[PDB]
Amino acid sequence: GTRGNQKIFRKRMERFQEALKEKDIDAAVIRTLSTFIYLTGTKWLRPSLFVPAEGEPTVFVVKGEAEEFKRRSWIENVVEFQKVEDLMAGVVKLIQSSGARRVGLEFGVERDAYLLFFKMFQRLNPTVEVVDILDITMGMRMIKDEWEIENIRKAAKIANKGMKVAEEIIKPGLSELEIAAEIYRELMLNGSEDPKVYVSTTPRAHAEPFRDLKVKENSVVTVVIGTDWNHYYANMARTFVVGEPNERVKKAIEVKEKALEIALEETKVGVPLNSVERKLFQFFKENGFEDSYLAGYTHGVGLLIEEPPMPTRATKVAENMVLSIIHTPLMIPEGAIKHEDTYLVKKDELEKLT
Amino acid sequence: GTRGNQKIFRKRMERFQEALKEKDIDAAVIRTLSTFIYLTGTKWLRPSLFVPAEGEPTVFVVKGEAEEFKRRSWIENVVEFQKVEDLMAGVVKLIQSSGARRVGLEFGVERDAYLLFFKMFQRLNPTVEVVDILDITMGMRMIKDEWEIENIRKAAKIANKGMKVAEEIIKPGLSELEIAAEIYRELMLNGSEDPKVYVSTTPRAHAEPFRDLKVKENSVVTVVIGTDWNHYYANMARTFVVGEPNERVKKAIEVKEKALEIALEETKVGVPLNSVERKLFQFFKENGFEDSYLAGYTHGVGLLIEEPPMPTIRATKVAENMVLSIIHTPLMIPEGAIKHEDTYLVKKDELEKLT
Ligand SMILES: [Co+2]
Ligand SMILES: [Co+2]
Ligand code: NA
Numbered sequence: 001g002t003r004g005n006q007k008i009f010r011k012r013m014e015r016f017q018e019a020l021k022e023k024d025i026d027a028a029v030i031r032t033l034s035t036f037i038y039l040t041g042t043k044w045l046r047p048s049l050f051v052p053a054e055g056e057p058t059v060f061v062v063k064g065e066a067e068e069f070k071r072r073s074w075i076e077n078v079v080e081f082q083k084v085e086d087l088m089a090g091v092v093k094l095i096q097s098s099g100a101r102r103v104g105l106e107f108g109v110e111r112d113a114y115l116l117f118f119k120m121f122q123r124l125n126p127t128v129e130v131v132d133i134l135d136i137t138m139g140m141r142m143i144k145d146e147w148e149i150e151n152i153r154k155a156a157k158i159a160n161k162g163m164k165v166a167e168e169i170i171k172p173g174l175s176e177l178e179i180a181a182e183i184y185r186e187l188m189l190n191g192s193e194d195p196k197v198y199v200s201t202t203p204r205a206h207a208e209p210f211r212d213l214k215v216k217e218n219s220v221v222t223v224v225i226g227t228d229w230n231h232y233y234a235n236m237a238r239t240f241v242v243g244e245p246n247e248r249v250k251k252a253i254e255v256k257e258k259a260l261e262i263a264l265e266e267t268k269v270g271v272p273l274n275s276v277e278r279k280l281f282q283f284f285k286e287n288g289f290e291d292s293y294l295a296g297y298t299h300g301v302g303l304l305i306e307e308p309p310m311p312t313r314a315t316k317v318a319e320n321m322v323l324s325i326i327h328t329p330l331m332i333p334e335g336a337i338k339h340e341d342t343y344l345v346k347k348d349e350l351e352k353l354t
Numbered sequence: 355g356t357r358g359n360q361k362i363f364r365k366r367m368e369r370f371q372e373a374l375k376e377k378d379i380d381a382a383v384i385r386t387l388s389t390f391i392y393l394t395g396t397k398w399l400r401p402s403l404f405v406p407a408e409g410e411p412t413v414f415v416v417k418g419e420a421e422e423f424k425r426r427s428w429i430e431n432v433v434e435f436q437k438v439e440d441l442m443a444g445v446v447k448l449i450q451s452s453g454a455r456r457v458g459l460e461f462g463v464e465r466d467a468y469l470l471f472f473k474m475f476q477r478l479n480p481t482v483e484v485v486d487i488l489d490i491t492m493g494m495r496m497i498k499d500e501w502e503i504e505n506i507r508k509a510a511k512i513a514n515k516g517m518k519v520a521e522e523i524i525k526p527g528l529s530e531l532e533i534a535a536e537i538y539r540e541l542m543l544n545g546s547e548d549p550k551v552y553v554s555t556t557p558r559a560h561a562e563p564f565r566d567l568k569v570k571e572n573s574v575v576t577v578v579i580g581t582d583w584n585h586y587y588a589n590m591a592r593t594f595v596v597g598e599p600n601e602r603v604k605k606a607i608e609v610k611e612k613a614l615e616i617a618l619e620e621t622k623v624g625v626p627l628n629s630v631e632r633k634l635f636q637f638f639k640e641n642g643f644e645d646s647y648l649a650g651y652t653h654g655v656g657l658l659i660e661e662p663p664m665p666t667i668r669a670t671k672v673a674e675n676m677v678l679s680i681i682h683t684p685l686m687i688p689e690g691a692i693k694h695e696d697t698y699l700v701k702k703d704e705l706e707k708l709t
Contacts, residue, residue, distance in 0.1 A: 001564070001565060001566060002564075002566065003566075043562075043564075045558070045559070045560030045561070045562055046559070046560055062558075062559040062648070062686065063645055063646065063647075063648070063686050064557040064645075064646060064686030064687065064688065064691070065557060065558060065559070065686070067688070068556045068557065068558065082647055082648055082649055083648075083649035083650075083666055084649075084666060084667060085666075105469070106469070107469040107470050107472075107473045108468065108469060108470055109466070109468040109469075109470045109471070110468070112463075113468050113469045113470070114462065114463040114464070114467055114468065114469070115459070115460070115461035115462060115463075115467045115468070115469065115472055116461050116462055116463045116467070116488070117463070118461075118469055118472070119461045119486065132473065134470070177542050177543075177545070177547060178542075178543060180542065181538070181539045181542035181543050182539070184535070184538055184539060184542070185535050185536070185538070185539045188531055188532075188534065188535035188538070189531075189532060189535050191531070191565045192565075193531055193562070193563060193564060193565055194562070202422055203418045203419060203422070204399070204416075204419060204422070205399070205400075205416040205419065206399030206400055207399070208397075208399055208547065208548070209542075209547065210547060211545040211546075211547055212355065291417065292417070292418060293417075293436060294416065294417065294436055294437075295436055295437035295438070296437070296438070311437070311438055312438045331416065331417055331418025331419070332418070333418070333421070336418075
């Protein structure tokens with residue numbers, strides 16, 4: 001989307017460079033897309049950002065992309081390459097020019113924090129010591145500023161349009177993939193550039209849709225939507241009842257509703273998440289759903305659908321965080337019962353955004 | 355509709371176990387989705403497959419998912435976990451139960467081959483030595499069987515339907531995201547479960563669509579489609595002329611056409627990819643497009659949109675029954691990334707265009 005004043009992204013770079021100097025980091029190689037967006041202000045495929053502790057950062061893009069990138073970003077130092085060897089050779093030159101011996105790398109769970117590029121980084125920089133900086137980059141992103149919240153608020157409205165389309169089209173006989181295709185179209189036509197949609201007619205925790213799984217009469221359909229505005233996501237999930245469900249499903253839905261009321265009021269500023277996770281586990285145990293419980297009731301939301309604090313020294317709920325509750329489904333043979341929303345953690349209160 | 359004969363996945367697992375024993379690898383942890391599908395026969399999110407060199411493999415899934423996975427896969431040993439700690443505790447138990455000293459990990463470029471899971475693996479398994487097995491897993495997938503080719507042929511037909519929608523809606527004033535939304539929907543309505551669509555009105559090599567980039571009059575729009583059937587992909591890319599292009603665009607498209615004639619004729623059984631890549635590099639240079647050239651004219655396609663053999667990333671030679679995308683690399687001019695890509699089946703002495 002590129003929207004947003006350039007002043008917010010430059011001060012992030014300054015504060016991030018300060019954080020690198022606090023941990024004796026000479027330079028940082030940012031290869032994750034979300035942090036690349038956080039520091040450069042724009043999404044660019046194959047994200048390659050070199051951040052020295054002292055000096056100006058440099059972005060590496062493909063030949064012919066320098067001008068297009070400069071229109072969307074405040075960064076002026078842009079180097080163009082035609083082969084991936086020139087990419088890596090350009091990075092080792094900025095490392096050896098800056099005399100950087102300790103370089104920070106994000107050990108994250110997104111592109112391009114892949115093992116191949118990590119093994120390639122160590123061999124072409126055989127002398128360098130790598131340091132994990134995921135705690136640094138996310139430690140800033142856990143607490144959102146006012147502009148980031150406005151992006152999430154608009155994404156929450158986009159998610160409501162996609163969930164409205166879902167509620168209107170879910171009929172017996174339609175496949176998970178056919179339903180998801182209509183949700184995707186609604187999200188993308190409203191400005192979302194990288195949405196993800198789950199549709200489950202069977203109990204699946206990460207239920208990317210299948211073509212041959214159709215909705216049945218007297219069943220339930222669970223829709224999970226993660227949609228973005230200005231690259232900031234908002235998450236909401238609903239379990240739709242089709243016809244008349246059986247007594248196990250109606251019980252599962254009722255227990256989940258009470259579990260949501262517990263997690264919402266118990267998630268306040270200052271309490272750790274594991275303090276809430278302990279109460280949800282015991283609650284499902286008393287109601288005979290111990291074998292259906294899952295750990296990880298919430299997670300951070302921002303430039304990623306799932307970002308720290310995530311379960312996959314106990315971090316406590318802090319102001320201006322964005323959390324998804326409840327993230328974990330109740331797994332019964334009829335489906336994964338979910339009811340998830342995006343909440344803004346305010347001064348000892350949770351504002352529902354979706 | 356058949357997700358694949360289960361005998362095909364059982365013989366793949368056995369052959370993969372044999373490769374582990376040939377290289378003195380005690381066990382392999384498969385965390386990449388494409389290899390998980392290749393060996394288990396089904397797509398399951400958060401792929402977690404433990405393959406011992408001798409014995410039966412084990413799949414880890416979420417509690418309540420065991421019965422569905424066993425219906426979709428030939429694998430019988432499925433372990434359920436409720437917290438991520440138990441998942442890791444289950445992996446380290448299978449390693450010491452098997453007495454494994456060297457464990458293979460795929461150092462790939464797809465989920466879930468992420469740095470975090472590697473940092474966690476050596477941390478929770480400090481005694482184990484990790485070895486790269488990406489050359490092993492890809493080496494099997496490089497040569498397709500008859501069933502794999504049948505899936506790619508069907509996905510190529512699906513790719514044609516999405517490109518037909520693209521040509522019919524591309525008008526000045528439409529955004530890249532709006533065009534991509536109609537392409538994505540059409541691909542999914544034909545059975546594709548994880549398609550990817552690039553739409554570029556500006557020169558971008560990996561052009562995921564933006565909401566605020568609109569189609570211009572007297573411009574060009576490049577559409578790249580990677581769409582799947584039974585998880586096997588087919589790739590096709592077209593550069594559409596909108597209105598009246600300038601002489602730079604007319605030359606770029608014409609030079610791209612001549613470059614395609616070289617890549618097709620020079621891609622024969624037995625020749626290395628860099629032997630063809632060198633002829634395209636010089637070709638763009640003579641026509642004044644050296645700053646518009648990109649390395650990597652082709653790549654394999656299958657359970658991944660881009661998979662080995664690639665020349666820009668082993669000196670692999672072209673062999674029969676491979677599937678390649680030609681030409682993958684665009685010509686980068688300020689008006690756009692000029693692309694013409696199709697999916698070809700490498701035959702004895704001919705390339706059959708599937709898209
Ligand atoms: Co969630
Ligand atoms: Co390609
Ligand atoms: Na089975």
